[PDB]
Amino acid sequence: MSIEKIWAREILDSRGNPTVEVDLYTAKGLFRAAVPSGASTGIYEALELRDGDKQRYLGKGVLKAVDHINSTIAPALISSGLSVVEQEKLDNLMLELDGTENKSKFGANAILGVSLAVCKAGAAERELPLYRHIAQLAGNSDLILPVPAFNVINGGSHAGNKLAMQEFMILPVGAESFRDAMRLGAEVYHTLKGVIKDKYGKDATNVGDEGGFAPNILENSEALELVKEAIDKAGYTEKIVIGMDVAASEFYRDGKYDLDFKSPTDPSRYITGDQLGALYQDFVRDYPVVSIEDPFDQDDWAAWSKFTANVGIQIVGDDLTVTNPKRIERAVEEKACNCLLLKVNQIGSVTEAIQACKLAQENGWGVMVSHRSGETEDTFIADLVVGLCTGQIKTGAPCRSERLAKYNQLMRIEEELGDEARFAGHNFRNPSVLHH
């Protein structure tokens, strides 16, 4: 026996919505994990199991998922007698048990919750820190501290402004270490808060779901101006660069794109994919933008491929690839992008998430580990990004502790790794060139 007990419960995430937490018990103690939740429901994503009872948490309860774990998944894994270190064997077993493709029987959140807890238990059984255990599961040996991407200006579907593009991020690529990167990010963030307060009023510095600011802006170029201004005023002009999550699937209108989709529908203002690309070109020219995520729709494959082949920055697939090995294989084929955004709950398990990572890295892609808009105090993805030697992660602004928890864990990891610890820096896309 390795697994003594697997027990799941219902906790609240950063937004106040129910989510899955799983406690796994072995002889070496308690191992706890919680599942993040996206804002929108992707059609290619593995199914997030919700109760749908409108009188309880407005239908967002996860009692059915919890029960699947406690009544079905838990006794089955204990029956198998498989060690907690057999991550692949245990993950696979849950998949056959679920039988479906998108994990619709047990739910991806139920399967991931157990998967994450197993990985933590297995790490103690190997007597390795979590990031080291993940490293061996992936086939890595030379660890890397990632460049953090702090979203500081927010737009898109769930922002109060008119700003169409979702996230504007800062990347301290010129930092001495990760701890140094945290300082740079925080200082620019508080500098930005002052710039926004002076230009938009004191009632414009409240934060969104991920700790970023959402002042009333329409022009995407204007959002970049604020960010660059804050960077320069903080005194880090070329030690910090800019990243973007456009989330273009959110304003995809009949084959075109609406950069004012939160205004009354006027189909005349729509622009083509080529037009949207030329806009990006201007941004790269006028601003230190080094990475753009979801620049086009999740099914606009022609636009992705055409853009990637003609720009030298990082193109990140999110809604396009949804951490799905099948979608990734197609994206490699068509050269749609050159970076995979890794969301573990999109695919539903640790084993499959590692496979998706290796699939991208072996084809010359970069990877970027990512949070969800609904997060918990769980810090698994901090150990994940290091173990996978990814070199880049976005897990929120330096505000709200569902974000800081990840960043704090990474600072502890850098401390623990000592002289072996290497910061990705300007090599966040391709950290392998530093490994020595």
Ligand X SMILES: O=C1[C@@H](P(=O)(O)O)CCCN1O
Other Cβ atoms less than 10 A from the Cβ of 261: the count is 17
Q: Which does 201 bind (CB under 5 to 8 A by kind): a second copy, ligand X, Mg ion, none?
A: a second copy
Site string for ligand X, 35-74 (x = CB under 6 A): ---xxx----------------------------------
Q: Which two tokens stand for residue 376?
A: 């918990």
Residue 402 near which of ligand X, Mg ion, a second copy, none (CB within 5-8 Å, type-dependent)? a second copy
Question: Does 245 interact with ligand X (rule: CB under 6 A)?
Answer: yes
158 has binding-site annotation: yes
37 known ligand binder = no
Map residue 34 onto helix, strand or coil. strand
39 interacts with, out of a second copy, ligand X, Mg ion, none, CB within 5 to 8 A per kind = ligand X
Alpha-carbon separation of residue 102 from 42, 109, 125, 178, 348 (angstroms): 11, 11, 30, 36, 9
What part of residues 239-268 is at the interface with Mg ion (CB under 5 A)? 245
Q: Does 373 show up as a binding residue in the annotation? A: yes
Q: Annotated catalytic, 362? A: no
H or E element in which residue 6 lies: strand 5-12
Cβ distance to Mg ion smaller for residue 60 or 372 = 372
103 is a catalytic site residue: no
Smallest CA-to-CA distance from 32 within 360, 378, 411 is with 378
Shortest Å, Cβ 399 to ligand X: 14
CA neighbor of 83 nearest in space, from 118, 113, 115: 118
Residues in contact with 62: Cβ distance below 8 Å, sequence separation at least 6, in sequence order: 10, 18, 19, 20, 49, 50, 51, 107, 109
Taking the least distance from each CB to ligand X, the nearer of 38 and 160 is 38
Is 293 annotated among the ligand-binding residues?
A: yes
Among 21, 318, 383, 414, binds ligand X (CB under 6 A): 318
**286 annotated ligand binder:** no
Q: Which letter does DSSP use for residue 66 in this model?
A: H
**Active-site residue among 239, 343, 352, 414?**
343
Rounded to whole angstroms, the Cα distance separating 181 from 138 reads 26
From the list ligand X, Mg ion, a second copy, none, pick the one residue 404 interacts with, judged by a Cβ distance below 5 to 8 Å according to partner type: a second copy
- Catalytic positions are 210, 343
**Interacting residues toward Mg ion by CB under 5 A:** 245, 318
